[PDB]
């Protein structure tokens, strides 16, 4: 049913790949004892404010700690950050887009 936000850590499972139509495929693995849980997802500008104008993958969740999650997103143009997870330990990747 309704899950709460993951409180654990996320690490990149593979390198971020981009598609022809300017989206990105993010593969993350999760560390935490609270799965199944909803994955905190966000994007930011260089300043740090949340863009999050679009997220293709609806309702990203960790169902099993041992299994990684695919998330597709549409970052803004130029330098931005993909942010997976919450808190001081959140996974923060830089990204650049044509």
């Amino acid at each position: 049913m309704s899950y709460v936000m993951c409180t654990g850590s996320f690490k990149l499972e593979k390198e971020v790949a981009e598609t022809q139509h300017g989206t990105v495929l993010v593969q993350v693995k999760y560390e935490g004892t609270d799965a199944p849980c909803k994955i905190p997802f966000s994007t930011q500008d260089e300043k740090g404010a949340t863009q999050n104008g679009r997220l293709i993958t609806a309702n990203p969740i960790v169902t099993d700690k041992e299994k990684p999650v695919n998330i597709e997103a549409e970052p803004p143009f130029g330098e931005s950050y993909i942010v997976v997870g919450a808190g001081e330990k959140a996974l923060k990747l830089s990204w650049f887009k044509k």
Partner: antibody
Amino acid sequence: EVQLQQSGPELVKPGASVKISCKASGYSFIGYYIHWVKQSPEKSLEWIGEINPRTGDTTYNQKFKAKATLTVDKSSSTAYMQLTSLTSEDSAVYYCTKRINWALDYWGQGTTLTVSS
Amino acid sequence: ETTVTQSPASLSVATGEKVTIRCITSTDIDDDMNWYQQKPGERPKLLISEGNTLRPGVPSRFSSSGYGTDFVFTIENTLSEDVADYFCLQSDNLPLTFGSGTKLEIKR
């Protein structure tokens, strides 16, 4: 700081059972998996299994599935491992660990189990 | 399971020399390899976690590398304090599996 304190040495007869404890402190016990590791007299390390202290969910190594049983107690923040049907092959040093950053870390001091009559 | 073959079983070097230990995995594990030191009478301690990540407080003379199935652990300028057993642990999938260990000794 983070600490895992294991129970003392055990001398058990062949055929009997034993239950080693592992008291956690210095962090949210609920927040991290506890794993158990066996170290044989020949110094070889085998992974026994893991337990989620929040839900009690466990995953075992197939090699230890019929011998080991992992439990937890949120109240005393203590993880337990029970070994049944003991033989001299079970004589070894047993460690408990906290999995964090995907690695086994903050190992306990170990518990020496001797299976002899 | 993912089999981990470690070599050599035993190694001896003089103070200041390079130590090279290796672990080969039966399956592809990316860089999910970890390295542990165990001094006599002590418990294993994590020197290096996944992606050649040196643990805080661990001397910079310890390093690692590899991606896929071929993994190496290195000691630069080996000190006499470094005598111990060294183990690798694959953290890619369950069950977790260890290398059989390497015994390090000093030539003097």
